[PDB]
Amino acid sequence: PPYTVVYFPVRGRCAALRMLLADQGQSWKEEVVTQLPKFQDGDLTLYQSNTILRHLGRTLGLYGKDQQEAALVDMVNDGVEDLRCKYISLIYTNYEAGKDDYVKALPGQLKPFETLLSQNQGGKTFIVGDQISFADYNLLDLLLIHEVLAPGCLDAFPLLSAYVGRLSARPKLKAFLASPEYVNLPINGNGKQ
């Protein structure tokens, strides 16, 4: 249906959603605000990034092939959101004093995703099952912003590296990620990354 995304003028908790829409060849309108995002799909109004991701998962079939996979998609997404919460708290609340210890902790925070990949067709497909889910887009965005926070952080992790390279190369997603609409938006809204 007709989509509208309302958010602050940053990537933030909106980036994964946008990546998903772009890659899935959906059209949407952006409305700027100077819990979000607010999302409109016909007469339906949604708030909160994870609730929006799940909705798009159901409607566009990005939620696993069955009930069991759906639950696994949720658990992976929970793990993405736990790290993202720690990121947001670092960025907006303790960047200076906190960063050194955050980056120290970071390889331990990434390993579980590497292991998860290692248990799903040799890490050659997606984070859950044989087809992309909303968890993949969210995990990709998380990995990308961590590479800015800590360049080289995926170097020790070959499945996660190939995974980012592979998903980033899907042609609609690639075009989106190279575009100014993505590249020229700040990651967060306080100058920090």
Binding site residues, as ranges?
A: 7, 13, 35-36, 48-49
The DSSP bridge partners found for residue 45 are 40
Instruction: State the burial class of residue 137 (Cβ atoms within 10 Å of its Cβ: 0-12, 13-18, 19+).
Output: buried
Contacting residues for 153 by C-beta, under 8 A, at least 6 apart: 103, 106, 107, 110, 146, 147
Instruction: Quote the CA–CA distance of 67 and 161 in Å, as a whole number.
Output: 29
How many amino acids of this chain bind a second copy (CB under 8 A)? 18
Binding positions for a second copy, 43-102, rule CB under 8 A: 44, 46-48, 51, 54-55, 58-59, 67-68, 70-71, 74-75, 78, 82
Task: Take residue 186 and report the two structure tokens written for it.
Answer: 């700040």
d(Cα 83, Cα 78) in Å, to the nearest integer?
9
178 touches, from a second copy, ligand ARS, none (C-beta below 5 to 8 Å by class): none
Place of tokens 């067709």: 121
Which residues, numbered 63-92, are part of the site for ligand ARS (CB under 6 A)?
A: 82, 85-86, 89
Binding residues for glutathione: 7, 13, 35-36, 48-49
Tell the smallest beta-carbon distance from residue 128 to a second copy (Å).
13
CA distance 9 to 190: 11
3-state secondary structure 94-140: CHHHHHHHHHHHHHHHHHHHHHHHHCCHHHCCCCCCCCCCHHHHHHH
Select from ligand ARS, a second copy, none the partner in contact with residue 89, using the beta carbon and a kind-dependent cut-off of 5 to 8 Å.
ligand ARS
In the complex, the smallest distance separating the C-beta of residue 113 from a second copy, rounded to whole angstroms, is 15
Quick note: the x/- pattern for a second copy over 3-42, rule CB under 8 A, is --------------------------------x-------
Beta carbon of residue 73, minimum distance to a second copy (angstroms, whole number): 10
Judged by beta carbon, residue 47 or residue 92, the one nearer a second copy is 47
Q: Which parts of this chain interact with a second copy (CB under 8 A)? A: 35, 44, 46-48, 51, 54-55, 58-59, 67-68, 70-71, 74-75, 78, 82
Q: Which parts of this chain interact with ligand ARS (CB under 6 A)? A: 82, 85-86, 89
